[PDB]
């Protein structure tokens, strides 16, 4: 028996997208929900929710334990894009060929749509049905650290301050460490939801950190080249050593080999 990532991604992406859709039921001021759904339901790879389910499932958890957190992660990812596209930031006029949130609804609504998604992410983790509350709190804490000044937002800030040819290699590492912070918390949250012991959470953390780095190397070899691609390989190789789980680890090993 051999493992097809394309099938897995297809199966998972389907279940994730119905969950995303169900999470935002349209009421009161319909424009806010519309603006949220517009960015959240515009398709994509959905790697972040999938990493979460992967990690949870590998450790013995179920889709039902991780699904809310998985949607939460995608909501956070979405709102970072909504905010990043704003004129005051990257000033993007379209994304995946479709116009960006603010171009459809206005900068004001876009800002609020992002805010709504960010807070809803936490609300949603906390409404997770069948999981001890202690685990959910840990996810919420880690999610907080990943998204804020010590993570995603932190990275975006350093990124903006460097947006300079003389930029150091360590300034490149802090910038890309924060997109890894989102990525790390995907597998970390999954593990915690499953009831993983701290050593496992660290195992996954380091796996996530390594993958995160590798992604930005190859995206740079489109930050680079013959030795750049060597590093990306050493790192994905170290990661793909979570052999202790054997067959259960196929999705994560597969997913890693995005080179």
Curated annotation (Swiss-Prot):
One of its GO terms (biological process) is farnesyl diphosphate biosynthetic process. InterPro entries: GGPPSyn_CRT-like, Isoprenoid_synthase_dom_sf, Polyprenyl_synt, Polyprenyl_synt_CS, Prenyl_diphosphate_synthase. Signal peptide: none annotated. Mg(2+) 1 binds at residues 84, 90. Its cofactor is Mg(2+). SUPFAM superfamilies: Terpenoid synthases. Gene3D superfamilies: Farnesyl Diphosphate Synthase. Keywords: Isoprene biosynthesis, Magnesium, Metal-binding, Transferase. Coiled coil: none annotated. Changing residue 79 to Y: Can only generate C15-farnesyl pyrophosphate (FPP) as the final product. It is an enzyme of class 2 (transferase). The record marks 79-80 as: Plays an important role in controlling prenyl chain elongation. The keyword Metal-binding applies. The keyword Plastid does not apply. Binds 2 Mg(2+) ions per subunit. Mg(2+) 2 binds at residues 84, 90. Changing residue 80 to F: Can only generate C15-farnesyl pyrophosphate (FPP) as the final product. Also produces some C10-geranyl pyrophosphate (GPP). GO terms for molecular function: metal ion binding; prenyltransferase activity. One of its GO terms (cellular component) is cytoplasm. Catalyzes the sequential condensation of three molecules of isopentenyl diphosphate (IPP) onto dimethylallyl diphosphate (DMAPP) to yield geranylgeranyl diphosphate (GGPP). Thereby, is a key enzyme for the biosynthesis of terpenenoids. This is Geranylgeranyl pyrophosphate synthase.
